[PDB]
């Protein structure tokens, strides 16, 4: 398992590293190809829309025809998309690359989630999902760093590197993932987790994407200060995801843990609103994301638990609605931020309270059922 789980973690890391690889080099591509702002908005939207559309079907196909096949095809698609972006000198080629990348993500993430759920002992699933969330975050962190480090020779080298990594990951998955040994439909158990993940993503991506702008406009944070705050928050979140998430899973339930994390998030966000000092903002930023960083593995575990033999479908639903929230969040957040500097934090607090209400309602329904 320590070799199959490692290759699954590598696949998910590759997907989320390729996601963030494009940030440092987007203006260079726009200037080189003579693209407008409408083109930039379309290029951003295409990947997210493709992932949204493909993720549930990808998970269903992983359930039906086997997860290893869907993962391998998704890795092939990832390599094709990265190479297409590497050699693309036209807007249509770039849009096709983004679409193929979104489809590859919507095929790889549901399959990897379902397989990690399937090959895990019942007492180890939570730890594995916490590790997966930490790996996803690490890929997000390392994407832009490698993309900007390897753009000093050419703004197209990162995508050649990413395509090569996709080839290596596909070969590793073919060799190392075990072939399957052998081999719900109700749309009522999945309603609360999809609503929860959608609301939480919509309100949390709003605060995450505009954090640097908010800190620069509020407390005069230089780029190194924002980097310090982001790295401290990421270190604390990773430490809690890797070490404490599974211990909380044995003690509490998924819903109780989610509610407590959301209440902690509300408290710390309120404390962040009323902070105007440099060191106050730094110290609050260090700990303001811990509950949010632990909510994602908890939601993945809840999706896994409420499912039966449809782990891939649960992964696909999670991917679809997480990406939907992550796309719609910052767009609304920036419009609100133009009128008040504290608007994204207000959206985060509001969605946290709504999530607490949703979790409590679902817990009460469960108690009434039993």
């Amino acid at each position, epitope marked *: 398992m320590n070799k199959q789980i490692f290759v699954l973690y590598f696949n998910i890391f590759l997907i989320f590293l390729g996601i963030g690889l494009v940030i440092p080099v987007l203006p260079v591509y726009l200037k080189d190809l003579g693209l407008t*702002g409408s083109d930039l908005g379309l290029l951003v939207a295409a990947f997210a829309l493709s992932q949204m559309i493909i993720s549930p079907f990808g998970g269903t196909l992983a359930d039906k025809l086997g997860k290893k096949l869907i993962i391998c095809i998704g890795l092939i698609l990832f390599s094709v998309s990265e190479f297409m972006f590497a050699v693309g000198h036209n807007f249509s080629v770039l849009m096709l690359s983004r679409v193929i990348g979104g489809m590859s993500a919507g095929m790889v993430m549901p399959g990897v989630t379902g397989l990690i759920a399937d090959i895990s002992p019942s007492h180890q699933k939570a730890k594995n999902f916490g590790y997966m969330s930490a790996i996803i975050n690490s890929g997000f962190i390392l994407g832009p760093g490698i993309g*900007g480090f390897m753009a000093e020779v050419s703004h197209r080298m990162p995508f050649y590197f990413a395509g090569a990594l996709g080839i290596l990951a596909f070969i590793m998955s073919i060799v190392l993932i075990h072939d399957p040994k052998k081999s719900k439909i109700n749309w009522k158990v999945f309603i609360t987790p999809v609503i929860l993940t959608l609301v939480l993503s919509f309100g949390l991506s709003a605060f995450e994407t505009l954090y640097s702008l908010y800190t620069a406009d509020k407390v005069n944070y230089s780029p190194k200060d924002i980097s310090i705050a982001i790295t401290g928050g990421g270190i604390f979140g990773a430490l809690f995801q890797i070490y404490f998430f599974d211990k909380f899973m044995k003690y509490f339930s998924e819903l109780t843990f989610i509610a407590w994390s959301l209440l902690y998030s509300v408290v710390v966000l309120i404390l962040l609103v009323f902070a105007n000092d440099y060191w106050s903002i730094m110290l609050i930023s260090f700990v303001v994301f811990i509950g949010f960083d632990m909510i994602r593995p908890a939601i993945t575990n809840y999706f896994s638990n409420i499912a039966g033999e449809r782990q891939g479908f649960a992964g696909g639903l999670n991917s679809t609605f997480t990406s939907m929230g992550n796309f719609i969040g910052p767009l609304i957040a920036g419009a609100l931020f133009d009128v008040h500097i504290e608007a994204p934090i207000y959206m985060a607090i509001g969605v946290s309270l709504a999530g607490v209400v949703i979790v409590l309602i679902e817990k009460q329904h469960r108690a009434a059922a039993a």
Partner: antibody, heavy 129, light 106 residues
Framework: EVQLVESGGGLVQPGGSLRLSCAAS????????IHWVRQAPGKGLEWVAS????????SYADSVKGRFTISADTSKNTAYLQMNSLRAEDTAVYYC??????????????????????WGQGTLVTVFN | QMTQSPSSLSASVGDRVTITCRAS??????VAWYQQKPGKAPKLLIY???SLYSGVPSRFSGSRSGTDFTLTISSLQPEDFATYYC?????????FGQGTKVEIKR
């Protein structure tokens, strides 16, 4: 994709009022605002006013506050700049521009790109009569 | 509305040019760059990007040094002889640069 067209500029009396219109068309995956920027003959660029497309919130320059009023109507996606008590320093070419911000989510890192993406042709306003 | 150095410079095609804009000390947000040719509207040249991302080499590269910002043109192509403006945003207002004109030498 988006087009901005100015209208309503011309000769005005030194003390009268004049209304500029910016007609805007086109859709983008961004947060947008409509701004007015004037250029005096031979001089640089000066920002004068701004209004938000959603939850319309106005903003004005210090040298123009009180005299000017920006508004928008979304029935035809149009913006208006009504300037009253026009003075000597108000003769310039007025452009309406579109500030657009695009977002790319990636955890607590991630890109945004903002600027005055689209500009109009501009209309000349001469205050002295 | 913001100080730009130099006010006007002249250089030959193929040369590398740097334009410095002195930005606000009350905000630390990035700066957008605009290009204007005579008789036409200004054109957005460089977007205002996230503070974490600024410095990737390119033909038109923006670089933040302390409180100042720098626009670098690596290769002076013939059609980029124009006036260049820096723009900074804030809570609600917008500030433009004084303007630097680039002229062709002979």
């Amino acid at each position: 994709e988006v087009q901005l067209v100015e209208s309503g500029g011309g000769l005005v009396q030194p003390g009268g009022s004049l209304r500029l219109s910016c007609a805007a068309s086109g859709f983008t995956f961004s947060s947008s605002s409509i701004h007015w920027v004037r250029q005096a003959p031979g001089k640089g660029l000066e920002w004068v006013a701004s209004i938000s497309s959603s939850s319309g919130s106005t903003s004005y320059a210090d040298s123009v506050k009180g005299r000017f009023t920006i508004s928008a109507d979304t029935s035809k996606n149009t913006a208006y700049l009504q300037m009253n008590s026009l003075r000597a320093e108000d003769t310039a070419v007025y452009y309406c521009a579109r500030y657009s911000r695009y977002y790319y989510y990636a955890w607590r890192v991630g890109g945004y790109w903002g600027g005055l993406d689209y500009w109009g042709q501009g209309t000349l306003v001469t205050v002295f009569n | 509305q913001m100080t730009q150095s130099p006010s006007s410079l002249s250089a030959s095609v193929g040369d590398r040019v740097t334009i410095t804009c002195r930005a606000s000390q009350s905000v630390s947000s990035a700066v957008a760059w605009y290009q204007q040719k005579p008789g036409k509207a200004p054109k957005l040249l460089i977007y205002s990007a996230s503070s974490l991302y600024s410095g990737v080499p390119s033909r038109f590269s923006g670089s933040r040094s302390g409180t100042d910002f720098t626009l670098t043109i690596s290769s002076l192509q013939p059609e980029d002889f124009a006036t260049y403006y820096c723009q900074q945003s804030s809570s609600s207002l917008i500030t433009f640069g004084q303007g630097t004109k680039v002229e062709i030498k002979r």
